[PDB]
Amino acid sequence: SLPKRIIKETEKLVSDPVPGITAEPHDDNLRYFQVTIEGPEQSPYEDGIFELELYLPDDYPMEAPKVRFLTKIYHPNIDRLGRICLDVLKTNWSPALQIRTVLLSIQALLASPNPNDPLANDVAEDWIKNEQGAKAKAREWTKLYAKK
Numbered sequence: 001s002l003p004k005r006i007i008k009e010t011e012k013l014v015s016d017p018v019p020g021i022t023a024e025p026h027d028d029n030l031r032y033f034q035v036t037i038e039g040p041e042q043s044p045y046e047d048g049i050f051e052l053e054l055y056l057p058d059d060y061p062m063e064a065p066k067v068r069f070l071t072k073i074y075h076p077n078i079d080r081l082g083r084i085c086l087d088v089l090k091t092n093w094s095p096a097l098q099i100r101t102v103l104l105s106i107q108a109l110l111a112s113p114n115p116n117d118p119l120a121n122d123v124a125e126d127w128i129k130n131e132q133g134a135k136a137k138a139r140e141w142t143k144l145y146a147k148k
Contacts, residue, residue, distance in 0.1 A: 006030055006056060009099050021103050023054070031056045035067075035103065039146065040111035044138035045073070048146025052082075052106070054099070064093035065102060072145040074138040076113050076120040076127050084109070085119050 010030055013023045020040075026032040033054040039045025051070040057063045067089065069082030077085045088097065088105055115124040127134040 002030055037107050043111050044135040045110055045142050048142040050146055061095040064089050065099055074141040076115040076124045079121055
């Protein structure tokens, strides 16, 4: 039987959604969600909508949700496979946290890329030394890969 906690979190996600984010169980399985996050206003991502897949593993909430961008995105803290570099998704996760907590952090990360992070990918240098060019590329990629 499906854990009560998952039913309760899902209901809250669909009944009172966070601004800019949509989360809906993919088909009848409540462990698989399709999530969209609007590109933050005043960011290179402002003209698009980004799609992410989120999975609740069998040991959730003791294990963190698994999340990945489906949409290709040019950002220093999101790799080429759409994996997100945040501690809350790794070592700092705990049952005290909720799915909503993670989506809020991801949305904030889009608005505040951190190229100085020691784990940033190779676009980090471009973002730091040629920011106008880096932001322009991020806007072009939004046009090319994100939903309008």
